[PDB]
């Protein structure tokens, strides 16, 4: 019995996982993303530098017996990318990708995994919406290569709209924290109540009530909010990405400007990609942190239920016939077997007359001095 949220990935699923990890990584590399493979463990000083409290609680701690210092098993690779970019990246544009195991102390959603295989891509050093647009095109090129029947639905948000309203309204921390709870739960009635006594309250109500209708959202806001340069641009970025997703990718987009998960680290646009009607996003992405950064990541293991490989060719050599061979005949047979394996056939040399591979599709059999493949 494994711990809750911890599962083996076995056999054909393991092969599929390895194929997905490799093919997605290679695609990223061909789009000019530099692969990096940081370690599972670091000192907490680097691993949790500027981390949120959720990330800290999500990170297992262990003690280094060589120094007596605290280390952590990573719950997120993104902070390691920042460390790497700071040392190696320079001032210009730098692109990175990665794929590695991460460990969580608690599952993120209901019945979630605590050991995802985290794969992702990140662009540093570009302020333009063009960097976000490029990331979308890479993501959707990757998704379309998987030939899934499952549909991805995208929810866009933008944390700057709420952050600017909170500045202009001069909200206290407890008022900010209450609205975030009400937004998280879309408690519209109680949000209506609280907003009647808050400064610029009707703006905070409008986000929740009408934030879905992004074309008209600016015109529903107060004159102070409509005069704020950062709100107008954030709303404009949402409209630009929505349009790009619909037109270039035939992608259903919803907008939610009250999506404020990772209030700590997100600095702008945010992206949540849902797979069919599954509760937790398959893809999470957005702007984050003077050096610009944007990126996404996903759990490769969640793609397993939505992808299929071609059926494998699983071959068994006849035990009796192989042992009847002279040395020269065996070397010719092994040459033939090496060539079959080079082509991706899975060929078992039997140890005994009962040795049978799981999922046998073919036998390699001798008929009149010729080894031929026959289906079972």
């Amino acid at each position: 019995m494994l711990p809750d949220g911890v599962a083996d990935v076995l056999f054909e699923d393991a092969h599929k996982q390895e194929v997905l990890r490799h093919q997605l990584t290679q695609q990223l590399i061909t789009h000019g993303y530099q692969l990096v493979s940081p370690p599972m463990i670091e000192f907490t000083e680097s691993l949790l530098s500027g981390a949120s409290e959720d990330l800290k609680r999500q990170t297992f701690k262990i003690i280094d017996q060589l120094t007596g210092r605290l280390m952590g098993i990573r719950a997120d690779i993104t902070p390691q990318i920042l460390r790497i970019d700071a040392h190696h990246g320079g001032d210009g544009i730098a692109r990175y990708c990665y794929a590695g195991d991460v460990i969580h102390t608690l599952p993120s959603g209901l019945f979630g995994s605590r050991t995802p295989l985290q794969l992702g891509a990140e662009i540093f050093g570009c302020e333009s919406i063009a960097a976000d647009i490029e990331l979308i095109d890479v993501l959707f090129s990757m998704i379309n290569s998987l030939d899934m029947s499952a549909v991805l639905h995208v929810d866009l948000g933008h944390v700057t709209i709420f952050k600017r309203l909170a500045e202009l309204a001069a909200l206290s921390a407890s008022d900010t924290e209450q609205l975030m709870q009400l937004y998280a739960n879309k408690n519209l009635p109680e949000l209506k109540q609280v907003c009647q006594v808050l400064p610029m309250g009707s703006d905070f109500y409008t986000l929740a009530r009408f934030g879905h209708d992004i074309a008209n959202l600016l015109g529903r806001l107060s004159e102070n909010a409509q005069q704020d340069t950062k709100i107008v641009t954030a709303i404009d970025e949402l409209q630009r990405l929505k349009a790009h997703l619909q037109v270039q990718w035939q992608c259903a987009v919803s907008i939610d400007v009250t999506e404020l998960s990772g209030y700590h680290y997100h600095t702008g646009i945010v992206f949540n990609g849902y797979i069919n009607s599954e509760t937790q996003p398959l893809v999470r992405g957005g702007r984050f942190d003077p050096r610009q950064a944007t990126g996404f990541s996903m759990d490769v293991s969640r793609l397993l239920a939505h992808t299929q490989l071609d059926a494998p060719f699983i071959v068994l050599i006849d035990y009796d016939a192989f042992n009847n061979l002279d040395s020269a005949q065996r070397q010719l047979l092994l040459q033939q077997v090496a060539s079959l394996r080079q082509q991706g056939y899975r060929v078992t040399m039997p140890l005994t007359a009962e040795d049978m591979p799981v999922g046998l599709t073919h036998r390699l059999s001798l008929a009149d001095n010729q080894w031929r493949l026959h289906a079972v």
């Binding site: 010719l332 047979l333 040459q335 033939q336 060539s339 080079q342 082509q343 001095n369 010729q370």
Partner: protein, 207 residues
């Protein structure tokens, strides 16, 4: 491509090869004339086929662009089969290399001018007869050359002798017998013998 590549000669040779292939594992899915395709799949997934000019087969095999091939012995002698193994006499597409001149015409009192495709064979043959010759290279219609004075004799492949007789020519000397041969690339013979042996044995059994 990890299987064998088989180089076949396009014209007269291809007709008599097809029965030998079908007896082995190999037979073409399409037809060479109807299709404007260079590389042909076969009934055997481990064998690929190239339909080439008869003159190009030894080149493709020797450089390893084909693993093995069927080629006329006239082509091999003219080419110099230095870097290939001549494994089997297939005994198909049989003919003779011969000299031919105009019917009853006398040999002139000078170095004989030989018009031929087979310039190395001509030179070699006439050297073995202790004769010095001026060789003229041609690619087609050898029959014509003596009729307009281009050479005194020709060297060409002869089967029935009807093409020579229909143009007022007669055969003079027999140079050698010719048949299509099975040639194999030196490296392929070592590295892909497992794939080759069953095909080699079926060709051997087919004669």
């Amino acid at each position: 491509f990890l299987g064998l590549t088989l180089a076949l000669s396009k014209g007269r040779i291809l007709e008599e090869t097809m029965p030998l292939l079908r007896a082995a594992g190999v037979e073409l899915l399409e037809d060479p004339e109807a299709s404007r395709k260079l590389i042909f799949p076969t009934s055997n997934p481990n064998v690929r086929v190239l339909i080439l000019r008869a003159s190009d087969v030894p080149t493709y095999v020797e450089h390893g662009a084909a693993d093995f091939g069927v080629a006329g012995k006239d082509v091999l002698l003219e080419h110099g089969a230095n870097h290939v193994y001549e494994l089997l006499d297939l005994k198909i597409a049989q003919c003779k290399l011969m000299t031919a001149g105009v019917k009853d015409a006398p040999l002139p009192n000078r170095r004989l001018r030989i018009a031929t495709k087979y310039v190395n064979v001509a030179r070699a043959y006439f050297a073995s007869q202790g004769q010095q010759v001026d060789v003229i290279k041609l690619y087609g219609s050898m029959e014509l050359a003596p009729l307009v004075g281009l050479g005194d004799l020709i060297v060409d492949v002869v089967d029935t002798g009807n093409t020579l007789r229909a143009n007022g020519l007669e055969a003079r000397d027999h140079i050698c017998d010719v048949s299509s041969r099975l040639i194999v690339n030196q490296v392929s013979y070592k590295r892909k013998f497992a794939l080759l042996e069953p095909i080699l044995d079926s060709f051997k059994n087919s004669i």
